[PDB]
Point group: C2
Chain length 467, copies 2
C-alpha cells in the first residue's frame, strides 16, 4: 500500500553518480540503485584552507562498486567571494589543487594533489583522456590548459594563451578583435616541474562567472593582466583519439591540438557569421598566433559527439546558440567546416546560457542546460542532433549545472546547486519520452557530476568529450 | 512505464528534515515533499577551523517553508582524530561552538555563536525546552549541562558534575563505585559570562565513543582529570514542564532537576540490579552529592514519553536494555518508580548499543536504534510501549544514528552515517506496518536529525524529550 522509494531506484540500473560540492567543501558518490551515498569526503579534513571542490571526472572501472578513481580540483582566493554567502575568511587559501581520489569499495582515499606533484595548479574543467591513461585541466584565471599522465601526475604538455587587443581599452578589447598567442609552456623547476601552483600565473583574481565578459570589460574584475585574458575553460577530447580541443571564452574560439606531436593545428571560429576557421600562424617552435578581426560573442561549452562526427561550441550571452562543425575528417582538423547552428526562441535574451551538454550513446539527441541568475527557473533543453533542432525544454529549479547519462542511454542525471545558498538537488530525466522523474536530495553546490564509466566506449558520453 | 520518485515524496507530507554532518562540516534542510535540499551551510565559510557539526534541535515554526530557527553545536580538538579518516590538520579549532542558524525561506543564515554570547561552550546533545523559549546543551568532556534563554542566548542555569571514585585506579574507578557531586556552575566574567569556551573545562581530550568506558578505564583516554569524569550526555525535558533530566554515562544515573527552582531533586539508578533511585544529599546551597555503591553498567539514552508518564534510560555495553520508570507523578520525582525493563536475547553481547529513540504521538510505540561497529548491519528496533516488549528488528546498514518522526506519526525518518568514511543515508520507515520504504542520499556524517516541528505539542516527539 505505501510507495517504496526502492521501486524508483530499481529502474535506474547499477550506476554510480559522483559529484563535488563547491562551497560545501565535499565530494560524494551515490548508488543510483539504492539511494545510498556510498562515500563522501571533506577536504577540510586534509588541511585544505579553501576547499572549493570544483570540476571532476572519473576513470572507467570494470566494477565501480568495487573501486574507481577520479580527479577533482579546487578554487581559492577571491573565488570565495563570488556568491551570496557572507563568507568571513578574508584571506583564504589559493586553491588550484588537483586532487586524485580513489574510492576503494568502502571509502574515498585522498591519494595526492597532482598540482604539488607536477607544479601546475588549474581550477576549471577536468576531463579524462579517451584512452583513460591521463586527464586534462583548464583554467580561465591563468589561461593554461594541460594534459597529465594518470600514473605519474606529471604534465605531458601544457599550453598558455594570451590576448593582444586591437584596442587597449577594456570595453573594446575583445569586441574590436585582437591576436591570441598560443605558447608551449615548459617546466622551470628541477625534476620536470612547473612553478604554477595556487595563484601563480593568475591574470585575473577570480574566474569569470556567467556574463563575466561584461564585468571584465567594465573594469570590475581585478587582476594583473585583465586586458590579456582569454578565459580558457576546458580541454576536451576527440573520442577517436589524436586531437584535444581548448575552448577560449573571451575570443570566441576553440584551438585544436595534436596531442602526441604537441602542436596546435586549427582554430575554430565560434560566432554565427564568422567563417568555419581562423588562420593559425607559426612564429617559432613554441609559439603560434591567430588574428581575430572582431569578437561578436563570447562562447563557452565545447565538445564532441560520441562518434567524433560533430564538434559543437556554444555561443553565450551576446549570441545564444550551438555552433556545429563537421569533424568527420579525423585526419585533418583544418578541413572541419560549419554544418549547422542550433537556434531557438528558448534562448530568450542574454539568458539563458548553455554551458553543459550530454549526448545519447547513438548521438541522435543531446541534453543541454539552460541557466539563469536567480530566480528564473533553470532547466534542460532536448536537442535533435540529426536535424540540429531544439525539441523540448523543461523547467526544474535554481542554478542548473552539469548533466550525465547512464551508459545504456536511459536516464540523464543532472545537478542543481542553489547558487551555493539555496535549493540543491540531483534530477533524473528519462530519455525515451523526456519526462522529469524527479529529484534526490543533495546538499552540495555541485559544478560537476559524472556517472562512473565501465568501458572506454562509455567515456565517449562522459567527462572526456564534453563538459 | 517509468516510476516517478515524486510519487514517493507525495506520500510523506509537508515536512522539513534537518541534519548536521559531523566531519562533513555542513548542515542541511531537506523538503520531504519534493526531494530537494532546501538549503545547506558549510561552517568553514564562517572561519570555523574544526567544523564537526554535531548535535542539533529545531524550534517550532507555524510554517517551516517560510522560516525556522535551530541550534547546532560543534566538537573539536582531538575529536578530529577518533575516526578512520586520516586527517592532516595541524592546528584544529577547539569546537564547542553553539551556533544559532535561521532558515529564512531561501537560505540558512548564521545568527551567532551562543558559546561566545554566554561564555559557555558544550559539545554533545542539544534539546529545545518544551515551552520553545530556550534550549539546553550537555557535554561529556567538561561534564556540564545548561539551559539557555532563546532570545538572549544567555545561561539560565548550569550544572557541573564530578566523580570521586572509591578506588583511585581507572580500571576500577566506576565499577567499584564512588560519589558524584552535583554543583551549581556560576559565571566569572563581566556581564554574567562564563570563561568556558573551546577546550576550557575539558577533563578528557575527546568525547567517549561507544564502549568508551572501557577505553577510559584502560588508560587510553588522555586528559587532565579522567578519574573525575562522569560523561554527561544530555539534558532532556519533561514535556509537562518543571523538570529536566541530565544523563550521566559513566555512573549510570540520571539526575532530575527543578528547572525554575534550580535544584536537583532525584537521582534515578540505571542498571538492572539497582533500586529505583539513589539518595540525593545536600551539602550546601550550591552543592549536592550522591553515593553509588558500584556502577553495574554505564548508560546512555534518556528520555520521556510524549505524555510524560514514562521515563526511560538505556543501559549500554555491560547491560543492553531499556530501563523504564513510572513518572506519572509530576509533582514529585522522588516518587518515580521502576515499572519495566525492555530486554532481548539479541542484546546479550557488548553490542548492539541503543542510543536513540522516538515515540509515536500516542506513546504506544517506540523506535530505537541498534548500533554496532563495522561491519555488523546496524538498524532499528520497534518497541511496544504499552507492554514494554520488542516487536520487530530491521537491518539497515552501517553506523545508525538518530531517529525523528513526522508529527502525524506516519513516518520515522533516521540517519546512517558511514563511521564518517563509508555509506550514509536517510532512511524512511512507515509506522503502520513498520516496513522500510527505503533510502535517500545524504553525503553527511549525521549524529542528529529532526523534523521541524509546528507546535509545542510536536516537540513532545522531537529533540526535546529524547535524543
Ligand atoms: Cu565551462
Ligand atoms: Cu564552476
Ligand atoms: Cu547521547
Ligand atoms: Cu556524536
Amino acid at each position: 500500500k505505501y510507495v517504496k522509494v526502492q521501486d524508483f531506484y530499481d529502474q535506474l540500473g547499477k550506476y554510480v553518480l559522483v559529484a563535488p560540492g563547491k562551497f560545501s567543501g565535499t565530494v560524494a558518490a551515490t548508488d543510483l540503485s539504492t539511494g545510498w551515498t556510498m562515500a563522501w569526503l571533506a577536504a577540510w579534513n586534509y588541511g585544505d584552507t579553501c576547499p572549493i571542490m570544483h570540476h571532476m571526472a572519473a576513470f572507467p572501472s570494470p566494477d565501480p562498486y568495487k573501486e574507481f578513481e577520479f580527479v577533482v580540483n579546487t578554487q581559492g582566493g577571491k573565488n570565495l567571494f563570488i556568491y551570496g554567502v557572507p563568507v568571513t575568511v578574508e584571506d583564504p587559501g589559493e586553491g588550484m589543487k588537483i586532487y586524485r581520489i580513489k574510492y576503494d569499495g568502502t571509502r574515498m582515499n585522498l591519494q595526492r594533489d597532482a598540482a604539488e606533484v607536477s607544479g601546475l595548479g588549474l581550477g576549471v574543467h577536468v576531463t579524462i583522456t579517451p584512452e583513460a591513461d591521463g586527464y586534462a585541466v583548464g583554467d580561465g584565471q591563468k589561461d593554461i590548459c594541460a594534459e597529465f599522465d594518470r600514473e605519474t601526475d606529471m604534465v605531458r604538455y601544457a599550453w598558455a594563451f594570451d590576448w593582444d587587443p586591437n584596442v587597449k581599452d577594456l570595453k573594446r578589447a575583445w569586441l574590436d578583435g585582437g591576436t591570441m598567442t598560443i605558447k608551449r609552456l615548459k617546466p622551470t623547476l628541477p625534476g620536470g616541474r612547473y612553478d604554477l601552483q595556487g595563484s601563480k600565473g593568475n591574470k585575473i583574481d577570480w574566474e569569470l562567472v556567467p556574463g563575466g565578459e561584461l564585468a571584465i570589460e567594465d573594469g570590475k574584475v581585478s587582476g594583473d593582466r585583465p586586458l590579456h585574458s582569454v578565459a580558457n575553460d576546458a580541454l576536451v577530447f576527440d573520442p577517436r583519439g589524436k586531437w584535444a580541443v581548448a575552448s577560449m571564452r573571451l575570443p570566441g574560439v576553440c584551438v585544436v591540438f595534436d596531442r602526441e606531436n604537441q602542436v596546435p593545428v586549427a582554430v575554430l571560429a565560434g560566432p554565427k557569421g564568422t567563417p568555419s576557421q581562423f588562420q593559425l600562424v607559426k612564429v617559432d617552435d613554441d609559439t603560434w598566433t591567430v588574428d581575430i578581426p572582431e569578437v561578436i560573442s563570447a562562447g563557452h561549452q565545447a565538445g564532441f559527439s560520441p562518434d567524433g562526427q560533430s564538434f559543437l561550441f556554444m555561443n553565450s550571452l551576446r549570441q545564444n546558440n550551438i555552433m556545429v562543425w563537421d569533424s568527420s575528417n579525423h585526419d585533418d582538423p583544418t578541413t572541419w567546416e560549419k554544418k549547422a547552428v542550433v537556434e531557438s526562441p528558448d534562448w530568450r535574451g542574454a539568458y539563458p546560457n548553455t554551458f553543459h551538454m550530454v549526448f545519447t550513446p547513438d548521438a541522435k539527441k543531446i541534453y543541454v542546460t539552460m541557466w539563469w541568475p536567480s530566480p528564473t527557473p533553470n532547466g534542460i533543453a532536448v536537442i535533435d542532433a540529426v536535424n540540429w533542432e531544439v525539441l523540448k525544454e523543461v523547467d526544474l529549479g535554481p542554478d542548473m549545472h552539469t548533466l550525465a547519462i547512464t551508459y545504456d542511454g536511459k536516464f540523464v542525471v543532472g545537478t542543481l546547486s542553489g547558487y551555493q545558498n539555496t535549493a540543491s538537488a540531483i534530477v533524473v530525466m528519462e530519455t525515451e519520452t523526456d519526462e522529469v522523474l524527479g529529484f534526490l536530495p543533495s546538499p552540495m553546490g555541485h559544478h560537476d557530476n559524472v556517472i562512473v564509466p565501465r568501458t572506454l566506449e562509455d567515456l565517449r558520453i562522459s567527462r572526456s568529450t564534453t563538459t
